[PDB]
Scaffold this active site. Structure first.
Site, mmCIF file in Angstrom:
data_model
loop_
_atom_site.group_PDB
_atom_site.id
_atom_site.type_symbol
_atom_site.label_atom_id
_atom_site.label_comp_id
_atom_site.label_asym_id
_atom_site.label_seq_id
_atom_site.Cartn_x
_atom_site.Cartn_y
_atom_site.Cartn_z
ATOM 1 N N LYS A 179 5.410 2.859 -4.036
ATOM 2 C CA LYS A 179 5.245 1.479 -4.521
ATOM 3 C C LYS A 179 6.514 2.470 -5.617
ATOM 4 O O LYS A 179 6.384 3.442 -5.936
ATOM 5 C CB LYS A 179 3.653 0.910 -5.328
ATOM 6 C CG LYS A 179 4.068 -0.230 -5.672
ATOM 7 C CD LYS A 179 4.172 -0.936 -4.537
ATOM 8 C CE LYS A 179 4.945 -2.856 -5.053
ATOM 9 N NZ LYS A 179 5.044 -3.512 -3.571
ATOM 10 N N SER A 214 8.198 0.431 -1.552
ATOM 11 C CA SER A 214 7.849 -1.155 -1.173
ATOM 12 C C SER A 214 7.737 -1.105 -3.013
ATOM 13 O O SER A 214 7.341 -0.135 -3.911
ATOM 14 C CB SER A 214 6.222 -1.343 -0.744
ATOM 15 O OG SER A 214 5.518 -2.601 -1.228
ATOM 16 N N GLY A 257 8.648 -4.885 4.357
ATOM 17 C CA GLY A 257 9.878 -5.216 4.390
ATOM 18 C C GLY A 257 10.638 -4.491 4.245
ATOM 19 O O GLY A 257 10.649 -4.621 2.697
#
Ligand SMILES: [Ca+2]
Ligand SMILES: [Ca+2]
Ligand SMILES: [Ca+2]
Ligand SMILES: [Ca+2]
Ligand SMILES: [Ca+2]
Ligand SMILES: [Ca+2]
Ligand SMILES: [Ca+2]
Ligand SMILES: [Ca+2]
Ligand SMILES: [Cl-]
Ligand SMILES: [Cl-]
Ligand SMILES: [Cl-]
Ligand SMILES: [Cl-]
Lengths: 362, 362, 362, 363
Positions: free
Chosen positions: D162, D232, D344
Site C-alpha cells: 500500500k 495499491s 487495478g
C-alpha cells in the site's frame, strides 16, 4: 429556557473531526450539549455511499472519547444525519446543534429551538409503506415536544435520515416470505424518503390521515410537506428526526425561516426563505448560519417548459444532478457554496421542488 | 451590409432537425444563408461523446438534401460546432446563425456580425502546442474579416470546436515516433481547448506573442482571452471558428454583449453581460436570443475559499460538473435553462471563470 | 439452394462503415443480399445511448446509396439490431448476415440457414401477455419453414426485435379504457422481451404451453428459452423474428451451435457452445465467425454463493457490469474479445445467465 | 520456535463488517495477537475518492484495538492494513487475514508459506514516484524478506504494497517548501506511486539491475517490471506498507504460494500456470485454493490481442475499474469463485497490460 447554538464547520474528508475538535478545545462547544450533527459527506449520496457511515463512525468515536462513554451510548444520545453527495461546487461540511439549559428572562420573540427523536428499526418490507409513515409521525410529534414547540406553524424544517434497500436485504425479505415495495435499490431510496416525508406531513397536520395510503406513496405528488427534508442511507435501519423551529421558551440568538422552491431554479424562493429568517437584503447575508434545502428532478422531465436529461441519464443518477443544480442556485444568491442541499424530494414540496430553510443570527 | 439572424431551437434528440425544418418550410430561414450552427448535444461532453458527430451528420444530411449539394459540400460551407454535455437542467438545443448580404441603409449604432473560418487538420502531436495556437490565430483573424469587424474591442465571443486525442491516436503517434502533449485522452481536451483559446487571445491582441510558448499552455493561467469559448470533440481533426461581435456594417436587429464570470457562481457577471447586450431589467429578459458561457473547475479546488470535489471525483469528470453548475446559475438569473454552457475554460477568462456573452434583440 | 454468409467486421467508431465498404468493393458482399446487421456500438448500452441510432443512420445512409433506395426503405429491407455497451475489453464491431441463392448441391449434412417472419401489430394492451407470446410462437414456426429447418433442435439462435409501450400508446389504451401490463415504458421493455422469449420457447417445445400464463411472464424465471435473443425497439409495433440454425438443405460453409450460460462466469457453457458448433480444441478457435450471448445480473445479488455489488452500485448500471463480465469470460476461452454480448435477458437462459451461440466455419 | 502462517479469506457484507473476523477470533481459530496483516477488497470505486479503504481500516483497527487492549494507533503500527478498493463486475468484497503463529513443531518438509511485513518511513510529497520511494521500498522489501525467513528471492511469490498519493493539500505543501511534485494530478500520482513502489520490489529481488532505474524511467519504460509486485494507492497513509509472501525452508505452514504473470487481461493460461505453481494440478484440486491475488490494468496500446477496446477513451468509467472487472471475471471463470483479490493499475507490475498473479493453496 433552552438556548440553541449552531456551528457550520467545513470538513476535509468524511472522517475529519478536526473542525469540531477545535471548537471543543477552544471552549466554544461543550461536547455534552451536542444534540444533533447534520452533515454533507462527499460520497455519491446514493445506495453505495459509505462516506455517510464513515463520518458517523468517526464522529461517534471522537465524542465517545471526549465524553467518557461508549460509542453505542453516543449514538443513542446524539442524532447523526449524514447526507451524501457533494456535487458541483457544494462544499462538504457538518452542522452541529448544541442545546443548553439557561436561566434567562422571557422575551416576546420566538427563537430557534431543536428537538430530536428516533424511530424503531424497520423491516425491509416496511420501507415506503404506512408503517414507516405512522412511526415517523409519532417520532416527529416526540421531537416537537423535545423542542418545546406546540404550534406546528412554528416548525420550519424537519430533517430525517431513513433506511434503504440493498440486494442482500431484499433477499432476506424474500427468504422470510415478504415482498418489498420496489426491487430497484436506488428507487428504494425514494420510497423511504417519501414515506418519511408523509409522516412529517401527517404529524404537522399538513395532510390529513385519510389521504395517506400505500398506493399514494411516491405517486400522488399533490400530497406533500412544506418543511420535510428526508435523506436515505445504507448506514442505518431506523429513522432519525431533527425538528427545527422557533419557540417562546427559547433563549437562542438565532431564528429559522423557510420557503418552498417551486422548481430547481427558483431563486425567488431562496430570497423568500432568507427574508423569512430576517435577512432582508444582500447586505445582511453575513447573518446566515446555514441554508438547508431539498432538490429534485421533476417527473415531467422539464423545468419551466424546457426539457432536461436528468431522468434519462444512465451515467449519473438524477439526485446527483439535482443537488448540483440547487446548490449552485443557492450559492449564487448567498455567495457561498457551503450550504446543505439534499436530493430526492418525494412529498417534500411540489413535484420538482422542495423546502428551503435558513438559520440566521438575529 | 450584412444582416445576421439567430435562431435558438429546442431539440428532442441529437439528430432532431424538426425545429430547423419548421423554420425553413415557413420561409423564415433560407437554408442557403445558414453560416453556422452551434449545438448543445446530450452526450457526456467528454471523449466518448458521439452525440456531437451524430448531430452534425444529421444536420449536414438534412441541409444537403435541402440545398441540392453533397454532405461534404455542406460541411465545407457551414460551421457545425456541437458542444456535448447537457448536465443538470441544461436544455439541448441548437443555435442557427443566418447571414446574408442586403441592400440596406446605414443606421447609427453597431449591430450583430458573424464570421466563420476553418483551420487545416492537425496531427495528434500538434494539439496543445504552438502549431495549433498560431494556426488558430490566423483563422480567427480571417473570421474577423468575414464578419467585417475591424476593432478587436467589438469582438464579444469567439466560439471554437477543436480536436482531441484518443487512445488509438496516441498509440499511432507513438508508432510514428512522435510524443503527444499528454497521454491522457480526457486531459488532451484541455490542451486542445487551451491552445485554441490562446490562439484567440493572440489574434485579438489580448496577449502578446512573446508570452506564449508550449510551456505556458495550460500552465500560465494569467494568460487568457476574455471572449474565447472552445470545445473539443472526437468528430473533427481541425479547428472551426465562429467570430461574433458588432459592426457598423451590420443590418441586423440583434446585438451581442459580454462579461467575464470571475468564478462559477458569479451571477453579477451574468447580469453584466445582459446589461452589455442592452437588457437593463427583468422585464426585458424576453429580448434574449441566447446566452453563451464557459464554465470550469478552478485549479485550486475551491470557490470563494470553499472546497469542492470536482477535481477529486473519479465517477464524474469535472467538466460535466462545471457545466451543470454554471447553467443553473445562468438559468436562475434569466429564468430559462435553455442556454449554451460549455465546460473546460483553460485560458478562457481567469482560472475558475469564463467568458459569458448574450445575444439580444435591440 | 440457400447459402448464408456471415461477416464479423471490426469498427473504429459507431459511424464507421469502412470495413463493410471494403467487403462490398471487393465483391465479397452483394449489398442487395444483406438481411441483417447485428452491431455492438460503444455507447453506454442503457437508456441514453445514441450510438445505436448513429450506427444505424450511418449504415442506412451508406447502403441507401449503394442500393439506390431511400434510407427509410433500407431500414425496412435490412434488420438493424444495435446492442450498445462495449464494456470491459469488449470490442465494437458489426456482424453482417448475407442470404443468397446458389447453383450448388447440398453440403453433406446440416449447414447454416436463416429464416425471417413478422407478427401482426400488437395493440398496447397485448404487449407482455399471452397475445404476444402466442403470436410470436406462430411466427417462429413460420421462420423455421422459411429457413427450411424442420427439427426445432436445429434452431440455435432466434433474434427478435419487439415493441414497447410509450406514453401515447398507453394513453390510447386508456382512451379505449384498457389496462396495459405495466405503467412505465422502461418496465414494458422487460415484459415485451420476456413474452417474446417465451414465444420462442413455446414454438420450439422448450417449455410446455400449460406452464405459460400472463401471471408467469416476468415472474416464473424457471421458464426460459435457450436460443432466444430479444431486444426492444421504439419504432415497430410488431415482433420481427430471425431464426438462425442448421438445415439439411443448405450450401453454407458455416454451422451454428449453442449452449446456455448458467451464470455470468460459466466458461463450461462457452466451451460446450464451441463444441456444439464443431470447434473441438484450442487449435480450431480461428474458425469462429462470432459468439452471440446474453448477459444478466442475477436477481439474488450473488454468483455461486458470492455477493457482488452490481445491483447496489449507483455509479455503474448493473447491465453494463454484466456485459463486461460475460464478455471477459467468453474472451478468456476464445482468446478474442470481439464478440456480441447483449443485455435484457428476461426468460433467455436462467436468472443471471443467458443463451450463448457460436457461428463457425466448417 | 517455528513460524506457521495461516491465511483466512473472509467474506464481508460492507467495508466496516468485522463479523467474519470476529467469528474466527471468538471460536479461538485466530489469536488476534498473531494477526500480522489484513489485505482487503473494499467496495468503493477503487480510484481517487474511495473512502471505503479508510473506513475498512478504521473499523478493523478499532475492533482489534478493543480485543487486544491497546490503542488504535498501536494496532496500526503493529498490523499491516492494505485495503484495495474497487469490486467491479462479480468481484466479491472480502478480507484476507494473515496470521503468524509460533508453534512447537519442526519445519514441514521442503518449503512452506512464509510472510514478512515491513513499513517504510513516511515520504515527502516530492518523493512519490521518484528514486527516494524506489530505494526506500527496496530496503523495506529486504527487511520483510528476512522477517519471513526467506533467503532466496526466487522463493518470493507476491509482494503486496500500500502506497501514498498526492492530494491538492500535499502538492501545495511541497510548493510552499520550494519543491515540485512528480505530477500535478491526484489520479496520475497513484500510478507514479504504484510504479515507483513496484520498481522498488524489482530492485530488492534482483529482477532488475539498479543501473536501469532512474526518475526518467518511472512510468515510462514499461520493459522494466517486477513479476511479483502488487501495489495499491490510497489517501490514508503517507508511507508504504509491504507484505512479502513466499515459501521458506523454516516454516510449518500447511500452505504454499505459487505465481505466474498474466501477459494481458484475458490470459487464463497464466491463471492455470499460477495454480500449477501452487501445487493445484487438476480441476478437482481447486478446492485447495485459499485465495488468488492478481494485478490488472488497461494496456496503453488500447487493444487486447489486436482488438480495440474503449477503456482508455471511456470518460464515464475509469479504466482501472474496467480492468479489475475483466481480470476478476477471467480468474473467476477458471477457479469458479469470484471472491478473489484483483487490484487495478499495474505499472511496472508485469508487462504493459498484464500483471502478476499468485495463488495461496493448501498442501
Ligand atoms: Ca423569547
Ligand atoms: Ca418535491
Ligand atoms: Ca447600424
Ligand atoms: Ca472519470
Ligand atoms: Ca478560465
Ligand atoms: Ca436470463
Ligand atoms: Ca483534499
Ligand atoms: Ca503491468
Ligand atoms: Cl425565480
Ligand atoms: Cl506554427
Ligand atoms: Cl442485467
Ligand atoms: Cl490465454
Amino acid at each position: 429556557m433552552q438556548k440553541v447554538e449552531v456551528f457550520r464547520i467545513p470538513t476535509a474528508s468524511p472522517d475529519d473531526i478536526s473542525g469540531l475538535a477545535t471548537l471543543i478545545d477552544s471552549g466554544k462547544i461543550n461536547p455534552a450539549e451536542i444534540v444533533a450533527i447534520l452533515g454533507k459527506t462527499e460520497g455519491n449520496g446514493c445506495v453505495n455511499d459509505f462516506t455517510r457511515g464513515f463520518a458517523t463512525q468517526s464522529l461517534a468515536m471522537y465524542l465517545a472519547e471526549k465524553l467518557g462513554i461508549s460509542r453505542e451510548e453516543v449514538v443513542k444520545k446524539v442524532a447523526f444525519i449524514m447526507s451524501g453527495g457533494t456535487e458541483g461546487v457544494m462544499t462538504p461540511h457538518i452542522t452541529v446543534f448544541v442545546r443548553k439549559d439557561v436561566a434567562a428572562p422571557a422575551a416576546p420573540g420566538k427563537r430557534l429551538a431543536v428537538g430530536v427523536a428516533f424511530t424503531r428499526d424497520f423491516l425491509p418490507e416496511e420501507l415506503g409503506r404506512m408503517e414507516q409513515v405512522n412511526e415517523v409521525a409519532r417520532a416527529v410529534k416526540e421531537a416537537m415536544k423535545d423542542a418545546q414547540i406546540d404550534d406546528p406553524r412554528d416548525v420550519h424544517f424537519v430533517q430525517i435520515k431513513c433506511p434503504l434497500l440493498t440486494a442482500e436485504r431484499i433477499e432476506d425479505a424474500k427468504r422470510r416470505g415478504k415482498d418489498v415495495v420496489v426491487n430497484d435499490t436506488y428507487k428504494s431510496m425514494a420510497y423511504s424518503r417519501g414515506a418519511s416525508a408523509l409522516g412529517v406531513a401527517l404529524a404537522l397536520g399538513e395532510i390529513s390521515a385519510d389521504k395517506i395510503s400505500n398506493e399514494a406513496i411516491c405517486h400522488d405528488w399533490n400530497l406533500y410537506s412544506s418543511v420535510a427534508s428526508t435523506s436515505a442511507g445504507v448506514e442505518l435501519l431506523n429513522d432519525e428526526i431533527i425538528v427545527v423551529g422557533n419557540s417562546t421558551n427559547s433563549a437562542s440568538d438565532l431564528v429559522i425561516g423557510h420557503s418552498v422552491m417551486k422548481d430547481a431554479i427558483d431563486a425567488d424562493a431562496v430570497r423568500a426563505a432568507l427574508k423569512d429568517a430576517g435577512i432582508r437584503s444582500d447586505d445582511e447575508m453575513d447573518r446566515i448560519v446555514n441554508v438547508l434545502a431539498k432538490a429534485e428532478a421533476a417527473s415531467s422531465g422539464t423545468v419551466r417548459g424546457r426539457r432536461n436529461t436528468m431522468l434519462d441519464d444512465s451515467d449519473i443518477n438524477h439526485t446527483r444532478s439535482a443537488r448540483a443544480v440547487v446548490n449552485a442556485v443557492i450559492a449564487s444568491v448567498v455567495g457561498d457554496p457551503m450550504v446543505y442541499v439534499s436530493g430526492g424530494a418525494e412529498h417534500q414540496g411540489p413535484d420538482g421542488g422542495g423546502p428551503i430553510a435558513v438559520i440566521a443570527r438575529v
